[PDB]
Paper text:
All three Sul enzymes adopted the (ɑ/β)8 TIM barrel fold also shared by DHPS.
Comparison of Sul apo and ligand-bound structures revealed conformational changes in these three loops triggered by ligand binding. In particular, loop 1 is oriented further away from the ligand-binding cleft in the apo structures of Sul2 and [name] as compared to the structures of these enzymes in 7,8-DHP or pABA-bound states. We noticed that the Phe residue that is conserved across Sul enzymes (Phe178 in Sul1, Phe179 in Sul2 and Phe177 in [name]) and localized to the active site adopted different rotamer conformations depending on ligand binding.
Author numbering:
A (entry chain A): -1 to 263
B (entry chain C): 0 to 263
Write the structure that this text describes.
Protein backbone atom coordinates (compact mmCIF):
# COMPACT_ATOMS: atom_id res chain seq x y z
CA UNK A 1 0.00 0.00 0.00
CA UNK A 2 0.99 3.66 0.26
CA UNK A 3 3.94 4.86 2.30
CA UNK A 4 5.18 8.32 3.30
CA UNK A 5 8.38 9.40 1.53
CA UNK A 6 11.21 10.53 3.80
CA UNK A 7 12.97 13.88 3.39
CA UNK A 8 16.34 13.71 5.11
CA UNK A 9 17.26 17.03 6.71
CA UNK A 10 20.89 18.03 6.05
CA UNK A 11 21.93 21.50 7.24
CA UNK A 12 25.34 22.35 5.77
CA UNK A 13 26.05 25.01 8.39
CA UNK A 14 25.56 22.93 11.56
CA UNK A 15 27.21 19.85 10.01
CA UNK A 16 30.24 21.93 9.03
CA UNK A 17 30.51 23.64 12.45
CA UNK A 18 29.99 20.67 14.81
CA UNK A 19 33.74 20.00 15.03
CA UNK A 20 34.37 23.44 16.49
CA UNK A 21 37.17 24.09 13.99
CA UNK A 22 35.39 27.18 12.61
CA UNK A 23 35.53 25.59 9.16
CA UNK A 24 33.02 25.83 6.31
CA UNK A 25 33.44 22.14 5.42
CA UNK A 26 30.80 20.84 3.04
CA UNK A 27 32.58 17.47 3.21
CA UNK A 28 31.07 16.75 6.64
CA UNK A 29 27.55 17.44 5.31
CA UNK A 30 28.10 15.37 2.17
CA UNK A 31 28.90 12.32 4.29
CA UNK A 32 25.97 13.07 6.59
CA UNK A 33 23.75 13.16 3.50
CA UNK A 34 25.13 9.82 2.30
CA UNK A 35 24.38 8.35 5.75
CA UNK A 36 20.75 9.48 5.52
CA UNK A 37 20.31 7.71 2.17
CA UNK A 38 21.71 4.53 3.73
CA UNK A 39 19.23 4.86 6.60
CA UNK A 40 16.48 5.01 3.99
CA UNK A 41 15.99 8.66 3.03
CA UNK A 42 14.10 9.00 -0.23
CA UNK A 43 15.05 12.66 -0.68
CA UNK A 44 17.79 14.78 0.91
CA UNK A 45 16.63 18.24 2.05
CA UNK A 46 19.51 20.73 1.69
CA UNK A 47 19.89 23.85 3.81
CA UNK A 48 22.71 26.36 3.45
CA UNK A 49 21.25 28.89 5.91
CA UNK A 50 18.91 28.87 8.90
CA UNK A 51 15.15 29.29 8.53
CA UNK A 52 14.93 32.06 11.12
CA UNK A 53 17.35 34.54 9.42
CA UNK A 54 18.14 36.72 12.42
CA UNK A 55 21.74 35.66 11.65
CA UNK A 56 24.12 38.39 10.46
CA UNK A 57 25.02 36.85 7.09
CA UNK A 58 22.23 35.91 4.67
CA UNK A 59 24.50 36.22 1.63
CA UNK A 60 23.19 34.94 -1.70
CA UNK A 61 26.68 34.36 -3.06
CA UNK A 62 27.75 32.19 -0.09
CA UNK A 63 24.43 30.30 0.13
CA UNK A 64 25.22 29.12 -3.39
CA UNK A 65 28.88 28.49 -2.47
CA UNK A 66 27.71 25.96 0.15
CA UNK A 67 25.07 24.17 -1.93
CA UNK A 68 27.52 23.98 -4.85
CA UNK A 69 29.77 21.04 -3.82
CA UNK A 70 27.02 19.18 -1.98
CA UNK A 71 24.64 19.22 -4.95
CA UNK A 72 27.46 18.13 -7.25
CA UNK A 73 28.47 15.15 -5.08
CA UNK A 74 24.90 14.06 -4.33
CA UNK A 75 23.67 14.34 -7.93
CA UNK A 76 26.49 12.10 -9.19
CA UNK A 77 25.32 9.36 -6.77
CA UNK A 78 21.72 9.57 -8.00
CA UNK A 79 20.40 11.22 -4.83
CA UNK A 80 17.06 13.03 -5.09
CA UNK A 81 17.98 16.55 -3.91
CA UNK A 82 15.68 19.07 -2.28
CA UNK A 83 17.01 22.54 -1.47
CA UNK A 84 15.30 24.59 1.23
CA UNK A 85 15.65 28.30 0.52
CA UNK A 86 13.53 31.44 0.32
CA UNK A 87 15.86 33.66 -1.77
CA UNK A 88 14.83 33.80 -5.46
CA UNK A 89 18.46 34.14 -6.53
CA UNK A 90 19.31 30.95 -4.65
CA UNK A 91 16.31 29.12 -6.12
CA UNK A 92 17.44 30.35 -9.56
CA UNK A 93 20.66 28.40 -9.07
CA UNK A 94 18.58 25.39 -7.98
CA UNK A 95 16.69 25.58 -11.27
CA UNK A 96 20.04 25.81 -13.04
CA UNK A 97 21.30 22.70 -11.23
CA UNK A 98 18.04 20.83 -11.93
CA UNK A 99 17.53 19.73 -8.35
CA UNK A 100 14.45 17.60 -7.73
CA UNK A 101 12.71 19.84 -5.17
CA UNK A 102 12.71 23.48 -4.07
CA UNK A 103 11.53 24.23 -0.51
CA UNK A 104 10.31 27.81 0.02
CA UNK A 105 9.30 28.81 3.55
CA UNK A 106 7.88 31.87 1.75
CA UNK A 107 5.87 29.87 -0.79
CA UNK A 108 7.21 31.50 -3.98
CA UNK A 109 5.77 35.04 -3.71
CA UNK A 110 8.08 36.49 -6.41
CA UNK A 111 6.38 36.22 -9.83
CA UNK A 112 9.63 37.34 -11.48
CA UNK A 113 10.76 33.72 -11.15
CA UNK A 114 7.52 31.89 -12.02
CA UNK A 115 8.22 31.44 -15.73
CA UNK A 116 11.49 29.62 -15.02
CA UNK A 117 9.96 27.41 -12.34
CA UNK A 118 7.40 26.33 -14.94
CA UNK A 119 9.94 25.35 -17.59
CA UNK A 120 11.94 23.21 -15.15
CA UNK A 121 10.65 19.84 -13.96
CA UNK A 122 11.42 20.83 -10.34
CA UNK A 123 8.77 19.80 -7.85
CA UNK A 124 7.83 22.73 -5.62
CA UNK A 125 6.92 22.32 -1.96
CA UNK A 126 4.76 25.29 -1.04
CA UNK A 127 5.00 26.14 2.65
CA UNK A 128 2.46 28.26 4.47
CA UNK A 129 4.12 30.47 7.08
CA UNK A 130 2.33 32.78 9.46
CA UNK A 131 5.54 34.72 10.17
CA UNK A 132 7.38 37.33 8.11
CA UNK A 133 11.14 37.25 7.62
CA UNK A 134 12.85 40.02 9.58
CA UNK A 135 9.78 40.96 11.64
CA UNK A 136 9.04 40.00 15.24
CA UNK A 137 7.85 36.54 16.21
CA UNK A 138 4.08 36.14 15.91
CA UNK A 139 2.10 34.18 18.50
CA UNK A 140 -0.98 33.36 16.43
CA UNK A 141 -3.52 32.91 19.22
CA UNK A 142 -6.47 31.70 17.08
CA UNK A 143 -5.76 28.22 15.62
CA UNK A 144 -8.89 27.96 13.47
CA UNK A 145 -8.07 31.40 12.07
CA UNK A 146 -4.60 30.19 11.09
CA UNK A 147 -6.11 27.11 9.47
CA UNK A 148 -8.67 28.91 7.28
CA UNK A 149 -6.14 31.61 6.39
CA UNK A 150 -3.74 28.81 5.46
CA UNK A 151 -6.40 27.41 3.14
CA UNK A 152 -6.98 30.81 1.51
CA UNK A 153 -3.24 31.41 1.14
CA UNK A 154 -2.94 28.09 -0.70
CA UNK A 155 -6.00 28.53 -2.95
CA UNK A 156 -4.56 31.85 -4.16
CA UNK A 157 -0.92 30.80 -4.49
CA UNK A 158 -1.65 27.51 -6.28
CA UNK A 159 -3.79 29.33 -8.85
CA UNK A 160 -1.09 31.99 -9.25
CA UNK A 161 1.58 29.38 -9.98
CA UNK A 162 -0.64 27.38 -12.32
CA UNK A 163 -1.56 30.48 -14.34
CA UNK A 164 2.14 31.25 -14.74
CA UNK A 165 2.54 27.82 -16.38
CA UNK A 166 3.64 25.54 -13.52
CA UNK A 167 2.07 22.09 -13.79
CA UNK A 168 -0.09 21.76 -10.70
CA UNK A 169 0.67 18.12 -9.89
CA UNK A 170 4.28 19.19 -9.27
CA UNK A 171 3.20 21.23 -6.21
CA UNK A 172 3.46 19.87 -2.67
CA UNK A 173 1.70 21.74 0.13
CA UNK A 174 3.46 22.10 3.49
CA UNK A 175 0.99 23.73 5.93
CA UNK A 176 3.89 24.54 8.25
CA UNK A 177 4.45 23.38 11.80
CA UNK A 178 5.33 24.82 15.18
CA UNK A 179 7.01 28.15 14.50
CA UNK A 180 5.28 28.60 11.14
CA UNK A 181 1.82 28.41 12.74
CA UNK A 182 2.44 30.72 15.69
CA UNK A 183 4.18 29.78 18.92
CA UNK A 184 0.79 28.46 20.08
CA UNK A 185 1.16 24.67 20.30
CA UNK A 186 -2.54 23.92 19.91
CA UNK A 187 -2.61 25.25 16.34
CA UNK A 188 0.27 22.89 15.55
CA UNK A 189 -1.86 19.98 16.82
CA UNK A 190 -4.84 21.32 14.86
CA UNK A 191 -2.97 21.25 11.54
CA UNK A 192 -1.60 17.79 12.38
CA UNK A 193 -5.05 16.26 12.87
CA UNK A 194 -6.59 18.20 9.98
CA UNK A 195 -4.10 17.93 7.11
CA UNK A 196 -6.18 15.31 5.20
CA UNK A 197 -8.65 18.15 4.53
CA UNK A 198 -5.82 19.95 2.68
CA UNK A 199 -5.33 16.91 0.45
CA UNK A 200 -9.04 16.52 -0.28
CA UNK A 201 -9.52 20.26 -0.82
CA UNK A 202 -6.76 20.47 -3.45
CA UNK A 203 -5.88 16.93 -4.64
CA UNK A 204 -2.22 17.71 -3.93
CA UNK A 205 0.46 15.94 -1.95
CA UNK A 206 1.04 17.14 1.60
CA UNK A 207 4.31 17.29 3.53
CA UNK A 208 4.32 17.06 7.34
CA UNK A 209 7.50 18.26 9.10
CA UNK A 210 7.20 17.85 12.87
CA UNK A 211 10.70 16.58 13.75
CA UNK A 212 11.93 18.09 17.04
CA UNK A 213 9.62 21.13 16.88
CA UNK A 214 9.22 22.91 20.20
CA UNK A 215 5.48 22.23 20.33
CA UNK A 216 6.29 18.55 20.82
CA UNK A 217 8.51 19.57 23.74
CA UNK A 218 5.70 21.59 25.31
CA UNK A 219 3.35 18.61 25.30
CA UNK A 220 5.89 16.30 26.95
CA UNK A 221 8.06 18.74 28.89
CA UNK A 222 11.11 17.42 27.06
CA UNK A 223 14.28 19.23 26.01
CA UNK A 224 15.42 19.56 22.38
CA UNK A 225 18.11 16.85 22.83
CA UNK A 226 15.38 14.34 23.80
CA UNK A 227 12.51 14.84 21.34
CA UNK A 228 12.95 11.56 19.44
CA UNK A 229 10.11 9.73 21.17
CA UNK A 230 7.49 12.52 20.79
CA UNK A 231 8.80 13.03 17.24
CA UNK A 232 8.33 9.35 16.35
CA UNK A 233 4.86 9.48 17.89
CA UNK A 234 3.93 12.36 15.57
CA UNK A 235 5.55 11.05 12.38
CA UNK A 236 3.80 7.72 12.90
CA UNK A 237 0.50 9.53 13.35
CA UNK A 238 0.94 11.47 10.10
CA UNK A 239 1.88 8.24 8.31
CA UNK A 240 -1.24 6.36 9.39
CA UNK A 241 -3.42 9.32 8.35
CA UNK A 242 -1.87 9.46 4.87
CA UNK A 243 0.96 11.99 4.84
CA UNK A 244 2.69 11.95 1.46
CA UNK A 245 6.04 13.24 2.72
CA UNK A 246 7.71 13.35 6.13
CA UNK A 247 10.63 15.67 6.87
CA UNK A 248 12.88 14.50 9.67
CA UNK A 249 16.39 14.49 11.08
CA UNK A 250 16.42 10.92 12.45
CA UNK A 251 15.58 9.35 9.09
CA UNK A 252 16.58 5.99 10.44
CA UNK A 253 14.47 6.03 13.59
CA UNK A 254 11.65 7.06 11.28
CA UNK A 255 12.42 4.27 8.82
CA UNK A 256 12.26 1.83 11.74
CA UNK A 257 8.94 3.27 12.90
CA UNK A 258 7.45 2.92 9.41
CA UNK A 259 8.94 -0.53 8.80
CA UNK A 260 7.49 -1.80 12.09
CA UNK A 261 4.11 -0.16 11.45
CA UNK A 262 3.72 -1.48 7.90
CA UNK A 263 4.66 -5.00 9.05
CA UNK A 264 2.00 -4.91 11.78
CA UNK A 265 -0.47 -2.93 9.65
CA UNK B 1 -8.62 3.86 26.85
CA UNK B 2 -5.16 4.09 28.39
CA UNK B 3 -2.39 1.53 28.73
CA UNK B 4 -0.47 1.23 32.00
CA UNK B 5 3.31 1.06 31.83
CA UNK B 6 5.34 -1.52 33.71
CA UNK B 7 8.77 -0.16 34.60
CA UNK B 8 11.60 -2.69 34.68
CA UNK B 9 13.96 -2.43 37.67
CA UNK B 10 16.70 -5.03 38.04
CA UNK B 11 18.34 -5.59 41.44
CA UNK B 12 21.93 -6.76 40.94
CA UNK B 13 24.54 -7.79 43.52
CA UNK B 14 27.92 -9.48 43.27
CA UNK B 15 28.76 -12.92 44.71
CA UNK B 16 30.52 -11.69 47.90
CA UNK B 17 28.77 -11.73 51.25
CA UNK B 18 27.01 -8.43 51.88
CA UNK B 19 28.63 -5.56 53.77
CA UNK B 20 27.40 -3.38 50.93
CA UNK B 21 24.07 -4.81 49.87
CA UNK B 22 22.45 -1.44 50.60
CA UNK B 23 24.31 0.40 47.84
CA UNK B 24 22.76 -2.03 45.35
CA UNK B 25 19.18 -2.04 46.59
CA UNK B 26 19.50 1.72 47.13
CA UNK B 27 20.20 2.30 43.44
CA UNK B 28 17.37 -0.06 42.49
CA UNK B 29 15.12 2.22 44.56
CA UNK B 30 16.62 5.33 42.97
CA UNK B 31 16.02 3.63 39.61
CA UNK B 32 12.40 2.83 40.47
CA UNK B 33 11.76 6.39 41.68
CA UNK B 34 13.22 7.83 38.48
CA UNK B 35 10.95 5.46 36.57
CA UNK B 36 7.86 6.71 38.40
CA UNK B 37 8.79 10.30 37.52
CA UNK B 38 9.12 9.12 33.90
CA UNK B 39 5.49 7.92 33.98
CA UNK B 40 5.53 4.36 35.36
CA UNK B 41 2.22 3.10 36.75
CA UNK B 42 3.81 -0.06 38.16
CA UNK B 43 7.41 -0.98 38.93
CA UNK B 44 8.34 -4.52 37.82
CA UNK B 45 10.99 -5.78 40.24
CA UNK B 46 13.54 -8.30 39.01
CA UNK B 47 15.93 -10.14 41.33
CA UNK B 48 17.35 -13.00 39.29
CA UNK B 49 20.51 -14.63 40.60
CA UNK B 50 24.00 -14.75 39.07
CA UNK B 51 23.40 -18.30 37.75
CA UNK B 52 19.66 -18.29 36.85
CA UNK B 53 18.88 -21.77 38.20
CA UNK B 54 16.71 -22.61 41.21
CA UNK B 55 18.37 -23.56 44.50
CA UNK B 56 17.50 -23.45 48.20
CA UNK B 57 20.24 -20.90 48.86
CA UNK B 58 19.47 -18.75 45.80
CA UNK B 59 15.88 -18.24 46.97
CA UNK B 60 16.85 -16.80 50.35
CA UNK B 61 19.15 -14.27 48.61
CA UNK B 62 16.59 -13.33 45.96
CA UNK B 63 14.21 -12.64 48.84
CA UNK B 64 17.06 -10.84 50.63
CA UNK B 65 17.36 -8.32 47.79
CA UNK B 66 13.63 -7.99 47.09
CA UNK B 67 12.90 -7.21 50.75
CA UNK B 68 14.34 -3.69 51.20
CA UNK B 69 13.28 -2.47 47.75
CA UNK B 70 9.70 -3.75 48.17
CA UNK B 71 9.59 -2.19 51.63
CA UNK B 72 10.98 1.18 50.51
CA UNK B 73 8.68 1.38 47.49
CA UNK B 74 5.31 0.70 49.04
CA UNK B 75 6.41 3.02 51.81
CA UNK B 76 6.33 5.64 49.03
CA UNK B 77 3.01 4.16 47.92
CA UNK B 78 4.25 2.78 44.56
CA UNK B 79 2.50 -0.20 42.97
CA UNK B 80 4.82 -3.21 42.90
CA UNK B 81 5.08 -6.16 40.53
CA UNK B 82 7.64 -8.89 41.24
CA UNK B 83 9.10 -10.91 38.37
CA UNK B 84 9.84 -14.32 39.90
CA UNK B 85 9.14 -17.96 39.12
CA UNK B 86 10.32 -19.65 42.35
CA UNK B 87 7.32 -20.64 44.52
CA UNK B 88 9.02 -19.75 47.81
CA UNK B 89 9.79 -16.28 46.40
CA UNK B 90 6.21 -15.98 45.15
CA UNK B 91 5.00 -16.91 48.65
CA UNK B 92 7.03 -14.11 50.20
CA UNK B 93 5.40 -11.81 47.63
CA UNK B 94 1.96 -13.03 48.71
CA UNK B 95 2.86 -12.06 52.28
CA UNK B 96 4.43 -8.82 51.05
CA UNK B 97 1.09 -8.07 49.29
CA UNK B 98 2.74 -6.86 46.10
CA UNK B 99 0.29 -5.70 43.45
CA UNK B 100 1.42 -8.19 40.78
CA UNK B 101 3.28 -11.50 40.59
CA UNK B 102 4.87 -11.92 37.16
CA UNK B 103 5.77 -15.57 36.62
CA UNK B 104 7.46 -16.49 33.35
CA UNK B 105 6.62 -20.16 34.01
CA UNK B 106 2.88 -19.43 34.16
CA UNK B 107 2.28 -20.85 37.65
CA UNK B 108 2.81 -24.53 36.71
CA UNK B 109 2.84 -25.74 40.33
CA UNK B 110 -0.65 -26.46 41.74
CA UNK B 111 0.91 -26.86 45.19
CA UNK B 112 1.14 -23.06 45.47
CA UNK B 113 -2.37 -22.44 44.11
CA UNK B 114 -3.90 -22.40 47.60
CA UNK B 115 -1.68 -19.55 48.79
CA UNK B 116 -2.24 -17.59 45.59
CA UNK B 117 -5.97 -17.71 46.35
CA UNK B 118 -5.69 -16.31 49.90
CA UNK B 119 -4.44 -12.98 48.53
CA UNK B 120 -5.36 -9.99 46.38
CA UNK B 121 -2.19 -9.88 44.25
CA UNK B 122 -2.84 -9.89 40.52
CA UNK B 123 -1.28 -12.84 38.70
CA UNK B 124 0.43 -12.07 35.41
CA UNK B 125 -0.30 -15.47 33.91
CA UNK B 126 2.34 -15.69 31.20
CA UNK B 127 2.45 -18.05 28.22
CA UNK B 128 5.58 -19.61 26.74
CA UNK B 129 6.01 -22.08 23.90
CA UNK B 130 8.33 -24.10 26.20
CA UNK B 131 6.37 -24.32 29.44
CA UNK B 132 6.82 -26.44 32.56
CA UNK B 133 4.51 -29.36 33.28
CA UNK B 134 3.08 -29.78 29.77
CA UNK B 135 2.79 -33.13 27.99
CA UNK B 136 2.19 -31.30 24.69
CA UNK B 137 4.98 -30.92 22.15
CA UNK B 138 6.31 -27.47 21.26
CA UNK B 139 4.77 -25.90 18.14
CA UNK B 140 6.62 -24.65 15.04
CA UNK B 141 3.99 -22.88 12.90
CA UNK B 142 2.57 -19.56 14.12
CA UNK B 143 -1.19 -20.06 13.68
CA UNK B 144 -0.71 -23.34 15.57
CA UNK B 145 1.41 -21.55 18.19
CA UNK B 146 -1.51 -19.12 18.57
CA UNK B 147 -4.25 -21.71 19.04
CA UNK B 148 -1.86 -23.67 21.29
CA UNK B 149 -1.49 -20.83 23.78
CA UNK B 150 -5.19 -20.00 23.41
CA UNK B 151 -5.91 -23.44 24.87
CA UNK B 152 -3.10 -23.03 27.40
CA UNK B 153 -4.79 -19.97 28.88
CA UNK B 154 -8.16 -21.74 28.84
CA UNK B 155 -6.90 -24.66 30.91
CA UNK B 156 -4.39 -22.84 33.14
CA UNK B 157 -7.09 -20.31 34.05
CA UNK B 158 -9.54 -23.08 34.96
CA UNK B 159 -6.94 -24.67 37.25
CA UNK B 160 -6.39 -21.33 39.01
CA UNK B 161 -10.03 -20.26 39.42
CA UNK B 162 -10.82 -23.75 40.76
CA UNK B 163 -8.12 -23.49 43.44
CA UNK B 164 -9.73 -20.28 44.70
CA UNK B 165 -8.21 -17.38 42.79
CA UNK B 166 -10.65 -14.88 41.31
CA UNK B 167 -10.41 -14.76 37.51
CA UNK B 168 -10.38 -10.93 37.60
CA UNK B 169 -6.86 -11.08 39.09
CA UNK B 170 -5.41 -13.08 36.17
CA UNK B 171 -3.65 -10.89 33.62
CA UNK B 172 -2.67 -12.77 30.45
CA UNK B 173 0.77 -12.27 28.89
CA UNK B 174 1.07 -14.22 25.61
CA UNK B 175 4.86 -13.74 25.62
CA UNK B 176 6.90 -12.31 22.76
CA UNK B 177 10.05 -12.91 20.74
CA UNK B 178 12.30 -15.83 21.69
CA UNK B 179 9.45 -17.04 23.95
CA UNK B 180 7.47 -17.94 20.78
CA UNK B 181 10.39 -19.54 18.91
CA UNK B 182 13.04 -17.99 16.68
CA UNK B 183 10.11 -17.32 14.33
CA UNK B 184 9.41 -13.56 13.98
CA UNK B 185 5.98 -14.06 12.47
CA UNK B 186 4.77 -15.75 15.63
CA UNK B 187 5.36 -12.61 17.69
CA UNK B 188 3.97 -10.56 14.77
CA UNK B 189 0.84 -12.75 14.63
CA UNK B 190 0.31 -12.48 18.39
CA UNK B 191 1.11 -8.75 18.28
CA UNK B 192 -1.85 -8.05 16.00
CA UNK B 193 -4.36 -10.71 17.08
CA UNK B 194 -3.89 -10.26 20.82
CA UNK B 195 -7.29 -8.51 21.06
CA UNK B 196 -8.66 -12.01 20.41
CA UNK B 197 -7.25 -12.96 23.82
CA UNK B 198 -9.15 -10.14 25.54
CA UNK B 199 -12.54 -10.86 23.99
CA UNK B 200 -12.32 -14.67 24.24
CA UNK B 201 -11.33 -14.58 27.94
CA UNK B 202 -12.76 -11.23 29.16
CA UNK B 203 -9.49 -10.32 30.82
CA UNK B 204 -6.56 -7.94 30.61
CA UNK B 205 -3.55 -8.52 28.37
CA UNK B 206 0.05 -7.56 29.05
CA UNK B 207 2.24 -6.85 26.05
CA UNK B 208 5.98 -7.05 26.75
CA UNK B 209 7.65 -6.20 23.45
CA UNK B 210 10.47 -3.85 24.50
CA UNK B 211 13.88 -4.57 22.94
CA UNK B 212 12.91 -8.04 21.64
CA UNK B 213 15.09 -9.38 18.85
CA UNK B 214 12.27 -10.13 16.41
CA UNK B 215 11.85 -6.37 15.92
CA UNK B 216 15.34 -6.50 14.42
CA UNK B 217 14.15 -8.96 11.78
CA UNK B 218 11.48 -6.50 10.60
CA UNK B 219 13.82 -3.51 10.73
CA UNK B 220 17.43 -4.53 10.18
CA UNK B 221 18.83 -2.38 12.99
CA UNK B 222 20.17 -2.81 16.53
CA UNK B 223 16.99 -3.05 18.58
CA UNK B 224 18.81 -4.10 21.78
CA UNK B 225 19.96 -0.51 22.50
CA UNK B 226 17.83 1.58 20.07
CA UNK B 227 14.59 3.36 20.92
CA UNK B 228 12.58 3.51 17.71
CA UNK B 229 11.76 -0.09 16.69
CA UNK B 230 10.66 -0.88 20.22
CA UNK B 231 8.59 2.32 20.51
CA UNK B 232 7.01 1.72 17.10
CA UNK B 233 5.75 -1.66 18.35
CA UNK B 234 4.65 -0.37 21.75
CA UNK B 235 2.51 2.33 20.11
CA UNK B 236 0.85 -0.30 17.93
CA UNK B 237 -0.12 -2.35 20.99
CA UNK B 238 -1.44 0.78 22.72
CA UNK B 239 -3.81 1.59 19.85
CA UNK B 240 -4.87 -2.06 19.63
CA UNK B 241 -5.94 -1.84 23.28
CA UNK B 242 -3.13 -3.42 25.32
CA UNK B 243 -3.96 -2.96 28.99
CA UNK B 244 -0.38 -3.15 30.27
CA UNK B 245 2.97 -2.50 28.60
CA UNK B 246 6.26 -3.75 30.04
CA UNK B 247 9.18 -1.60 28.94
CA UNK B 248 12.68 -0.49 29.87
CA UNK B 249 12.50 3.00 28.28
CA UNK B 250 9.52 4.26 30.26
CA UNK B 251 10.23 7.92 29.49
CA UNK B 252 10.22 7.42 25.72
CA UNK B 253 6.99 5.44 26.04
CA UNK B 254 5.19 7.91 28.35
CA UNK B 255 5.94 10.86 26.05
CA UNK B 256 4.91 8.95 22.94
CA UNK B 257 1.52 8.34 24.57
CA UNK B 258 1.20 12.00 25.58
CA UNK B 259 1.54 12.94 21.91
CA UNK B 260 -0.90 10.25 20.79
CA UNK B 261 -3.46 11.54 23.30
CA UNK B 262 -3.17 15.16 22.18
CA UNK B 263 -3.87 13.85 18.66
CA UNK B 264 -6.77 11.67 19.87
CL1 LIG C 1 -10.47 27.30 0.35
CL1 LIG D 1 22.29 -1.03 13.37
CL1 LIG E 1 22.55 4.05 15.78
Amino acid sequence: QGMSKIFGIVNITTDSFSDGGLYLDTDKAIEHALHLVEDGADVIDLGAASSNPDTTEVGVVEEIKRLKPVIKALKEKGISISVDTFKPEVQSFCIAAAVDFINDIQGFPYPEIYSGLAKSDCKLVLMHSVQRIGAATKVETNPEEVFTSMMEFFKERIAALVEAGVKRERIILDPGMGFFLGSNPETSILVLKRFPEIQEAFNLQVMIAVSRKSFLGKITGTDVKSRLAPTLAAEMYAYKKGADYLRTHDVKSLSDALKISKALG
